[PDB]
Design a protein around this ligand. Structure first.
Ligand SMILES: Cc1cc2nc3c(=O)[nH]c(=O)nc-3n(C[C@H](O)[C@H](O)[C@H](O)COP(=O)(O)OP(=O)(O)OC[C@H]3O[C@@H](n4cnc5c(N)ncnc54)[C@H](O)[C@@H]3O)c2cc1C
Ligand SMILES: Cc1cc2nc3c(=O)[nH]c(=O)nc-3n(C[C@H](O)[C@H](O)[C@H](O)COP(=O)(O)OP(=O)(O)OC[C@H]3O[C@@H](n4cnc5c(N)ncnc54)[C@H](O)[C@@H]3O)c2cc1C
Ligand SMILES: COc1ccc(C(=O)N2CCC3(CC2)C(=O)N(CC(=O)NCCc2ccc(Cl)cc2Cl)CN3c2ccccc2)c(OC)c1
Ligand SMILES: COc1ccc(C(=O)N2CCC3(CC2)C(=O)N(CC(=O)NCCc2ccc(Cl)cc2Cl)CN3c2ccccc2)c(OC)c1
Lengths: 464, 463
């Protein structure tokens, strides 16, 4: 039985990064993955996803603003090509992971890991073999799986993001359950490629986790794009009759049946917690069936850590990575910085215009008891926005009055996902609106919209 | 007719300074005879970025139609691009007037000439002539095009003004000056099928940037089809009606260049003559730019100078910032000096963009710092690949003492938007170690910055 200082389960964004950090800190490392090196993100998530969003974005432009941009000529778009490009990008990143594992002398174990003890891991190698490994520390980065609508099930026409993302051919129509980022993005792409799209969301607003002002704007954008979004509507059942699928939904005691060629299941993702002997390791779960964890990613078992979607704190790639680093550094006894309140971490939805936020929404900060101060700046008043051809959206900043400290940021606009860094940095290192308003922003850029809010937070904006 | 503050010029610096002044309860009056919003909003910034956007789409299609599964025969009409640039421009200019009324700032439509240290003589556009006194004055007269020594303007030898206000495009053009402005025109024109040749006296293009950036940008422009001649000196320009002949010197040998039009954009001199700066007693510097202290305060106590006229960093956001400092200093409000202007951000908007701040690698080494460099290529960035352009890189320069930043230099798809975090950190003493802990959303270009931070602190992770 080979023995490693550290052993990681799962090669996703969190796993492969936690191994890299471990290796750097001089820790004998081995990573166990049976299928996805780079996990969901690099294989059938983040990576292929954002490549497709880019193709859809172009179709959107060369279709609605072609004339406004002085572009003429009848052009067509082949989704097949978009599909092929997303797979190549995926292949590239995946090949890059192995390079990193190699560069860092990280041992690769190709199979499925199952805890047989708090320090022993039995593996079912992909080539039929079997090998057990011991370890002083273990990092569980097993990820999550798509949660299905209760009672429903997968089939030829009822699928998860996986079967859909790996589909080179597009259906005529589709019904998406869940108005979260994942659901909205597939909607943006598909709709732009000519697919009939209807998105159902139990909650009252699309992207319910975002600030209220953001949900409204985005819903207005999608309705215009031609996508039908039904909020406060419950998906009762899903029936795949082959030639088509029938989904029944209810709202205010009144039911109606929706029908389409396919239906995508995307209401949530449950942490992968069963099937690999967590019980034999003694790792406890939370009431939401997620691996319980502390500020240093430690489970109820001192030497066993849990990172990534599997802990369900913030199911995003950058978070997984970050937690991976924290787990690694803590094991090696090196200097680290707990992520702290995960609500403060940044997040983005990549439909166009983007959605980027961090921290608390206006209403949450209100309920939390802060002396809420708000500054909203519309992009219709931003030079760069008008120059790019998309002056919609806005920048909404939430802060506390006492010292002008940032509580949260909520943005909707062209590629606004790249404007968050400044906000989170200031929030983390006690920089207030006063210090923020003194940062000169290049002209003309979307980032100037952040400068204005800083001013409208400290007092009154200048160009407004 | 007296005011607490009087602003000369209504460009980015003047009109923003007037707003701030007004906000501080100061009676304010601004004098402008032609361009409300100045160069920037009328014939600079605003229309320029609009045209650059159009040219980008032409590029995106031409260069990558196939790669994106976009097939078909499309054609682009510059005239329409032109039309939109004017509309976007007129929109902003109208915005200037709106803010002037909203802040009860008085508009004076004429040219201002100093008579005293507190008196301005105004030649009204209507033909009349009036006088105005003030306790404080802000000079935001901008700059003008500096012509190549011994040459002059003519039918086919123009400045950025004529060129940018031209709805029709030439078949060929020669550009004098490989600065951002010239490079941007080269980008636009080339994408629209114009033969483009850019002549630069200095050995590199974008000579003010970091050498690695100059090298990288020159490569992409050559791939675009733009001919750039560096270490080449423009000797003379002969407008012959049909074709313009530009005599140049490269490698101690004289050769001729020919095109229909020639754009003069090697530099811009601060507007300092013709309006009585001497009557007011304001002193100019060796380079003939109004001298100012860290508060935009000239040798004349109650007289300030902001924008291009002081030549510190000729950019609109710089112009706006100094105006705020001036207005606050005048009212005696809470203010913060801009500090070392070299530490201010700047971006060139060709595609890919160029974005930087602080010192170049060579400058930091020359300054005597304990240079530490971390460079990350976008070929390793998921977002860059998704975008369809993994070219470019992020190059950060820091001092090894505590890991304080000295400069940032990048080239990549819309990198101009990525500077905020860097200038903020350098401004409030946040070192590499602090910056290395800021989480960046995935997948974004900003992640490249994140890797560089780790590189400075020790080892990157995804490279
Ligand atoms: C369509 C889609 C788009 C997305 N877009 C984004 C985006 O733009 N940005 C973002 O930040 N996030 C995005 N996400 C979410 C992101 O993919 C996840 O947050 C991230 O993959 C979680 O990383 P992880 O390492 O925790 O787990 P995963 O990437 O899920 O990897 C876990 C790995 O563990 C392996 N494993 C499981 N059990 C075992 C075992 N017992 N033994 C060995 N190996 C095991 C699995 O095979 C799997 O490959 C997206 C998700 C989807 C579905
Ligand atoms: C083609 C081009 C593109 C550019 N693009 C950018 C860009 O993308 N980003 C950027 O940051 N910068 C850009 N610039 C530079 C930017 O335009 C200048 O830095 C900025 O305009 C300077 O502002 P200012 O207020 O100092 O002066 P200006 O905007 O030049 O305004 C000076 C004003 O003063 C008036 N004036 C002069 N003398 C008198 C007098 N005696 N009495 C009354 N009024 C007077 C003038 O009529 C004029 O309107 C660009 C420049 C050009 C030429
Ligand atoms: C483009 O990349 C993507 C892909 C997915 C999402 C998304 O919709 N998420 C992930 C983040 C989310 C909500 C769901 C989360 O998992 N968190 C916890 C959470 O919401 N709770 C889930 C935990 C849970 C609940 C019940 C049960 Cl039974 C189990 C579990 Cl584990 C916080 N959070 C979020 C918060 C604010 C704004 C935006 C997002 C996303 O959103 C921007 C971007
Ligand atoms: C897309 O927006 C634009 C439009 C113009 C420029 C540009 O070419 N500039 C302005 C900044 C500049 C160099 C010239 C400057 O004015 N500086 C001072 C300066 O050089 N002083 C010149 C003033 C002057 C000129 C002529 C005369 Cl006769 C006197 C004086 Cl005082 C430094 N500097 C700079 C540019 C890039 C990286 C680092 C620094 C630009 O550049 C990014 C972007």
């Amino acid at each position: 039985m080979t023995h490693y200082d550290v052993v990681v389960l799962g090669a996703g964004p969190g796993g492969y990064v936690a191994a890299i950090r471990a290796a750097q800190l001089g820790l004998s490392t081995a990573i166990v993955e049976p299928k996805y090196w780079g996990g969901v993100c690099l294989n059938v998530g983040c990576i292929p996803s954002k490549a497709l969003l880019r193709n859809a974005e172009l179709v959107h432009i060369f279709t609605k603003d072609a004339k406004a941009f002085g572009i003429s000529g009848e052009v067509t778009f082949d989704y097949g090509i978009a599909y092929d490009r997303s797979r190549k990008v995926a292949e590239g990143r995946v090949a890059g992971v192995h390079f990193l594992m190699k560069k860092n002398k990280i041992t690769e174990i190709h199979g499925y890991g199952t805890f047989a003890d708090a320090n022993t891991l039995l593996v079912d190698l992909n080539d039929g073999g079997t090998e057990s490994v011991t370890f002083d520390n273990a990092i569980i980065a097993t990820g999550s799986s798509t949660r299905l609508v209760p009672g429903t099930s997968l089939s030829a026409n009822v699928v998860t993001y996986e079967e859909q993302i790996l589909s080179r051919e597009l259906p005529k129509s589709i019904i998406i359950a869940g108005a979260g980022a994942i659901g909205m993005e597939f909607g943006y792409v598909l709709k732009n490629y000519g697919v009939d799209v209807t998105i159902v969301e139990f909650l009252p607003r699309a992207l319910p986790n975002e600030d209220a002002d953001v949900s409204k704007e985005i819903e207005k954008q999608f309705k215009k794009l031609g996508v039908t979004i039904l909020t406060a509507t419950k998906v009762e059942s899903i029936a795949d009759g082959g030639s088509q699928v029938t989904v029944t939904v209810t709202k205010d005691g009144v039911a109606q049946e929706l029908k389409a060629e396919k239906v995508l299941q995307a209401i949530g993702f449950a942490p992968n917690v069963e099937g690999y002997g967590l019980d034999k390791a003694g790792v406890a779960l939370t009431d939401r069936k997620a691996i319980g964890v502390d500020d240093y990613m430690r489970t109820n078992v001192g030497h066993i850590y849990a990172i990534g979607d599997v802990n369900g704190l913030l199911q995003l790639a950058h978070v997984a990575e970050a937690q991976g680093v924290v787990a690694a550094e803590t094991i090696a006894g090196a200097e680290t910085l707990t992520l702290g309140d995960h609500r403060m971490l940044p997040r983005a939805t990549f439909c166009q215009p983007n959605v980027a936020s961090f921290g608390l929404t206006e209403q949450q900060a209100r309920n939390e008891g802060y002396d809420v101060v708000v500054a909203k700046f519309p992009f219709t008043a931003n030079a760069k926005a008008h120059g790019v051809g998309d002056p919609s959206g806005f920048v909404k900043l939430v802060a506390d009055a006492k010292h002008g400290e940032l509580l949260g940021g909520h943005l909707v606009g062209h590629d606004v996902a790249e404007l968050l860094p400044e906000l989170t940095l200031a929030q983390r290192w006690d920089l207030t609106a006063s210090e923020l308003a003194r940062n000169v922003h290049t002209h003309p850029t979307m980032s100037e919209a952040l400068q204005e809010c800083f001013h409208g937070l400290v007092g009154h904006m200048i160009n407004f």
